[PDB]
């Protein structure tokens, strides 16, 4: 029945392979887009008011039902087909699916003569379908299918196709909603604040954030205040319990301290009370706010009716936000007060702003879900200005001319194409970032790419709390992976068992705890909260119970039954504090753990029997679920939760640590990420290198995606030979590096050879390189398209003529066809054309725009795709190929933070050579281990050797006590080589032993992205810029280096002004003026008929002629745009 | 304070054991690009002829 | 030309170069030179720039040259030193046992720009003709300049008791008119400080003598490792069991003194010392077992290299590493800290769900108990992160402070 | 994509090996014994046999661009 | 002069001069593929 | 883009001498033989052949770089011989010894192949 | 019309060894023949012409390599071991070429390399000590050594120098390894002999 020791290693990872097989690496994507069409498309349109527009007749136009069809392509003739994400991605569309709406218009005049009139399936809009979704035409389909539509079976999906490019949605950072926060701000007329982010459980407004604060000691006492929303003064809490109501200071003591045996409370509330004495009724508090606020009426009425409105509505709306709710908001503000005062009195800590239980994951369904709302106001906005310049004539109206689509549909693809997530006209209030290009560089590049998180602080912030790795990442974020550049700690990766909520609505749940004991809480008497516990339901305090413990014992029995509660919803029990928090809403991070009996798994061994047989008797992962074996623990349940690392955990020892465990981690390897699942024994490196691999893994050449002859990427890297490593780690088995691996096995040497692998850099085999070791093939694409935008002026793909073409290079065009296109299998090299377009003129009626090869690249056209954009013109890509031979400068890795460039080649008889003729593949230089302290890349090395000799995959698992050093020397030592990985080596020059026996064997290595003839550079006397005559910018404009100002101050120092006067004014922008020598201003010169004269002084005599840099002329003219004499005065 | 410039090259460094330390060693590509304007005398007429 | 390489710090990052044409699509440098520009090749990019006019070329050639910029201002001392494989290769070149066969000798006599043409009588004639390391980097060392230094592993009681002339481990560096007298060379004698070789060299002898001693130094040195060979392998981060039990008893011990001072804590037995709160004191003592034991346990590991080691090797030679860097790799990687203090309490009252609640013991708050090479636990291998995470956060964040 | 010619250490021939190892791995071989079997000695001709995915085997699921 | 294309879902060899609408005679397709050039490139099988 | 073709290694440019001697100044009785298109194969089997003459002095020779395709052999020689006279009996001592050694291998081969 | 790119194809065929043996010291160099870019006097022309019709995928081998030399064959195609696979075919994939095949060696590119390992040895036990064991006792012996297993390496010689060096030259199958051995003796032989005859120009010039 349980579970042994010696079983446990194929049990836990066939646990983990199944829940693989179940959920996949992108579910979180697919689940945050599925909830968005399922649930939140729907909620959104029935939550739009309905227009009520009247003169007289009235329409109401009530919106009822949504319908999204599948992902179709309207041509020029109109007729709607299924269109298939590679036909997007090759045509330039939008892979999206029309959403139509029912609308139900009745006519109400006089007399009750009513009748209704419902357009079924009106139009709505275009939304974006993210690939791989329950609404994606890749559905359900096969291998084969997907083979069959040009399709990857191992492409994950979760992104989005704009206009060709797909995009992925950035999963985002922000604090949870709807929970009390208590901080302590050090600079600040406040001593404490608690804040709460409040937002209704269907969003139709942004979060109001109410916070209530105490003064900073220093009248009398410390005074608690309340900054309301849509207010700009502060308000004491007194004055808004009595404005909702409760006048009596009894009253209002009774809502917030619920104790009445504690003077602790009492006295640090009294100043509160003092404060507020003169006002004493509910009406005479509400003119206060009104006028405490920034819109003071002149007359109370409308002050009264305003704060009225605003305490309704923008003050708490997760509590309600209908009438008559005043009973729950003054006992969750009272909630809050005490809770300020629990913090100020030190017996409750201050909240942690970096802990994970306090953020949510906005993921691609509630972030279209924001972008919806914007966008259906507008439309129904736009309908109703519409429906009134007809009604107004007093005739009928047609909504489907009312209802233009363009709203929805450009706003849904502007936001995905750009990243700027918000409206296109406020693109500067809109945060950019969101909705990346997918990175299609590696197979591993996609994956973490679709598995991002965005922490959205600001890069310009210079606190590292934020970018710190908090302790509640374990097992929801990777520890690792993280850019090391201007972004660290801000942009994560999910761990591999992450899994962000959907979300789910608390009706359930709060139906059961009213059948069950709970008491309401406007039911209850306040004196019955002291020893009772609070229940919080998505952050509103909904009522209190009496015996926590079995209540949780419920819950808990429940959740593992897939009984109401679902397994994402997380139930929280604080014990020293009373409440039990719980919350279904979306956004909370969690990842599954075995549950522990007394000291015992509930995982017994009949479970890993049926999910051995998995694909017979589809016992999957989800029926280990409701088995109530695993649960999914979020971040803030945690907390409350008592981990085994292993189920050796739950022995009892001599000196027992916990003996009351309640979960179990199913393997601690699963708290890294994609990228750092790749890394052979991260456990015996320093962290920074796993970090800095993590990032390397990104940009490791291998084949990005099996169906990588139908993309027209703009750049795409395939490796010749990529091989599976020899030392592996058990999670590729579920992130398809073995499918689609970034590398090769490379016999590698660490050793001092010839001096021309020190600081960071690698000597290869030229023979190794010859038989293609760590070739790779360079797919770049170019893009073109013959606008025929009007009569004035139209395009065309066409062999262009030295006769009729007026801006035609000297470069040839022959290699052209006469559709103007260049042919595959032709040898291309730079500058050459292989798109010749002309177009009309207003040497004559037509001048030459041809495409030309991006300069000295060499390629060869692999294919030539033509067809018609979504307008509809003749749309051409075209695929060169150039195939990258490794060499000198070429930027090569290992899975451990040991990256460098080639030093040089030698030939297999310039390498040194063991006994059996083996050279090494590379060699790598002593020196970068010791500071680095990356005993992975040796213990990877030693374990390589033992793989190759014995026929295996060496399992480099992180956290495995079956495997260490030892074992793997005395593996080694049975194979006849010395037991270290040390080997007698021969000068492969002079063909003598090398003294010092070296370390040599198999290591996974990585071609990087970055080869040097993609960087070298170089310029004399090139093309300038327009504003200021200075080089261009980039090695693509043929530009200049900038000669910036650190490099002025190194020559200043130095001394050399000859030299700094080239840099900074010969070789970047020479220029001459001519000065008037009365006014010091710039005039005029004819030099052709000699005639100099200055305006300003009618005099043309004294003028003197100055060489200064043509931007010190702009400047000096951009200061007389501003009214400024700048006069260079020559005397 | 800080421009573009012309007669400029940018590209991987490598390391080269050979080299003094006073040495540069540069690519044929980036010194066929680049060039140094040489004033013509009779004492180099000839050399400047054949270049 | 000059060559360039950003961040521009001080006026060594950009100095003049003469150019030599080679093959391929890089700029090689010497090895020497990476240090000013603080260069490696990881992928680094350098800009050159190519003065247009005799002046400026002049100006260059006079100012900003590579042999004029040895010794910088800044600290007056040199600004570029003998580097990695150089210097191990020196380390073990020097050493007192290094034996030259004719052949070999005149092969590194090859590589000697600055070589008279007349070998030099061998240290041992008989039975068989073999020259000294130290015979060959006499001939390297130029002109007649005298110095005296001391290997870093020169033992701090010998220059009182006898042997001060005669060194048992033949430490303290002696050149004399040029010819290294005896002892083993080093960061110490060819590194950047202020009074080594290479500086003596630049005061007594100029730059153009300085330049070439660089290119000879490294010249002969490469060409001898080619024979002599350094390497690096799991062999030299294994010790013998009777290390790896030493190891084990000290942290054993370690672990029981901080539950002995958590017990003291927990029964109000420890009374706070002047200037701190009581948590304070009870960190400083459980922070100073913690080092105690680290510092322990990586002297047991240091002793117990052997003279083969390459990580000695590397750490000697000052070429590369720290004898912190032998003990994380042999020993223990120790206490992880985030702003200073052990790991903070993330949860409630717990760094890790892991854990039970106020657990102030020493893995519990970051104490990586294990080596590189034995691997770290789950809990240690997070905390690591963390720690490595500070490293990383201060890394990019002091660079906008500093430049400004 | 598909097997290599030669070893890219030693220059050894694996080109011809590939289908062989297959058709020993399905004849109840351990990678070993079938490396051993086809006379791969040297562990960097066992490298390029043993570290070897067949993509090819991918990219023939796709039908070509022509009938 | 004929510049055929072939179509990238019936795989149909079908001729196109210029300005016509990229479509594929046989079924529609809008995607088209330009054949191997006969032009004569040369490897080095290196 | 900067790769030099592969048989720039083995093949002389035109006008490129395959071996130039310049008499070394330093001391008497020395060369430097520059050879052009050899590499360490030709150079350390002529150094240590060179080193087998009693009256050779000095032996030495050296690729000044990798990249480039050129060795330097120094030959210094007792006042009463001479380095050219040194270098030739080195290559006709090593032809001589490939020339028995190639004739002894396919007397080994026949022997192994018949029995 | 196969999945591997025309530089994948060409690449792969370089890398076939073709039989050499008696007609590598006939044929020329391009370089030293008098023709135009091929003959047969200093090149061999291969054809390779392959069309997948059928359902199952079609390997093309290097039996596909069809020669116009009988002489010069892919080994694996000379009359066990598999022939080298090209590339695998789907049905309506296609692959038509025509190779040339000149003589080179090592030196230019590693497919003129006839060795597929080149184990070379001297003093098995480490009698010269040009290698330093830290633990000689760790290290295993070699195949050549003559030690008892007490024994770990040799008592250290001072008057020793490198003789008795040990060979096993392994064939691609271009070359037979004694022709390898063979035609390396006349080629260092031959080299020997033109940097004579060079030598000699160079001393009567002088
Ligand atoms: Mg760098
Ligand atoms: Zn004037
Ligand atoms: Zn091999
Ligand atoms: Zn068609
Ligand atoms: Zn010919």
Redo the contacts between chains.
Sequence with gaps: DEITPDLWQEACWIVISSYFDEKGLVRQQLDSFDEFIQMSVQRIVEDAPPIDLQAPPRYLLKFEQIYLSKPTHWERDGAPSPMMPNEARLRNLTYSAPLYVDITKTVIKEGEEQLQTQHQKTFIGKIPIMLRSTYCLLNGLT??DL??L?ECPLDPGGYFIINGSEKVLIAQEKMATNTVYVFAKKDSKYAYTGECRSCLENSSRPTSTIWVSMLARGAIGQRIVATLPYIKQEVPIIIVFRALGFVSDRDILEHIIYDFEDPEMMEMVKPSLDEAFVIQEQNVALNFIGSRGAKPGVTKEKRIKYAKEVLQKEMLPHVGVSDFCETKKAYFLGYMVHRLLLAALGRRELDDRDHYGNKRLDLAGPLLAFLFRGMFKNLLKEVRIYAQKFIDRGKDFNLELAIKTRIISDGLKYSLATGNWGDQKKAHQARAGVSQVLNRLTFASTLSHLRRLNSPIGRDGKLAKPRQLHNTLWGMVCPAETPEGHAVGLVKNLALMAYISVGSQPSPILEFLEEWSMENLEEISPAAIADATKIFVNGCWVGIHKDPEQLMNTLRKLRRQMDIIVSEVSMIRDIREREIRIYTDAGRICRPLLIVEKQKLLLKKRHIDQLKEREYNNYSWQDLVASGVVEYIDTLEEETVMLAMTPDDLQEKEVAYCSTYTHCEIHPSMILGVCASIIPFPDHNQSPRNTYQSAMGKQAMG?YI??F??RMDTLAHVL???????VTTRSMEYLRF????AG????VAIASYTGYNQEDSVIM?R??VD???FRSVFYRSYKEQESKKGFDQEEVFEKPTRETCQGMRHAIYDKLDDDGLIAPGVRVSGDDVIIGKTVTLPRYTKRDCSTFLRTSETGIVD?VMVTLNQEGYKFCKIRVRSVRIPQIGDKFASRHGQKGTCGIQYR?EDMPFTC??????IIINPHAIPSRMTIGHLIECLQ??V???????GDATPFNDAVNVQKISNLLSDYGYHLRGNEVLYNGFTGRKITSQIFIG?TYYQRLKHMVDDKIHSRARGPIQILNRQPMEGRSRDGGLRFGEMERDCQIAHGAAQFLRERLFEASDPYQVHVCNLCGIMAIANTRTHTYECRGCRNKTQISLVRMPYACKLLFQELMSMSIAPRMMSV | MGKRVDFSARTVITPDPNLSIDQVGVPRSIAANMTFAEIVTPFNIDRLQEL | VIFNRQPTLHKMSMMGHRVRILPWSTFRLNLSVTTPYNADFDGDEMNLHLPQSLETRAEIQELAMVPRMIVTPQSNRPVMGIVQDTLTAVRKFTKRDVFLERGEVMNLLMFLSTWDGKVPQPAILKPRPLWTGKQIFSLIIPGHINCIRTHSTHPDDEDSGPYKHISPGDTKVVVENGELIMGILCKKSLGTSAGSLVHISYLEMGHDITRLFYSNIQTVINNWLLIEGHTIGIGDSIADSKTYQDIQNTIKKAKQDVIEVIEKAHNNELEPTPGNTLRQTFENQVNRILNDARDKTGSSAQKSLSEYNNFKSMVVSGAKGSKINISQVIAVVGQQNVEGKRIPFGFKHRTLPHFIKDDYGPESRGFVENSYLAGLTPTEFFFHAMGGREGLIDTAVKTAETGY | ?????????????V??????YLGLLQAEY???????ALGLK???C??ML????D????????????? | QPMIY?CGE????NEIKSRDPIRCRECGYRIM?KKRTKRLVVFDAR | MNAPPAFESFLLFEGEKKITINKDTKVPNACLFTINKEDHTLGNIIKSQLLKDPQVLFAGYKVPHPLEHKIIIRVQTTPDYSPQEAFTNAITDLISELSLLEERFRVAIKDKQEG | ?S??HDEFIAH?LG???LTSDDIVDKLQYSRDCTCEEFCPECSVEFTLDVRCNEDQ?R?V??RDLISNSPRVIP??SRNE?????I????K??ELRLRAYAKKGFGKEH?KW?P???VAFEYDPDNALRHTVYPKPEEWPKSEYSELDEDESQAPYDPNGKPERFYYNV?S??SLRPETIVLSALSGLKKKLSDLQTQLSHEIQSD
């Design positions: 291998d084969r083979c069959e040009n084949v099996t169906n002859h139908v010749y030979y990529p091989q599976k490593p020899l073995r499918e689609l691996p090769i096995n490379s016999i085999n023979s190794a038989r293609g070791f294919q297999q059996e003729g083996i050279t090494p593949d390589g050797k793989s190759a000799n014995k026929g295996e995959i198999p | 994509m598909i097997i290599p010619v030669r070893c890219f250490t030693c220059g050894k021939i080109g011809n090996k590939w289908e062989a351990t990678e070993g014994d079938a490396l051993d040297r562990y960097c066992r490298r043993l570290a070897h995915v993509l090819i085997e991918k990219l023939l699921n796709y039908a070509p661009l022509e009938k | 072939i019936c795989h149909t060899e593929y | 019309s999945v591997l792969r890398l076939i060894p995928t390997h081998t290097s080994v694996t071991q598999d022939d080298i696979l590339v695998k075919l789907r309506g994939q590693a390399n060795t597929a390992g392994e691609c199958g």
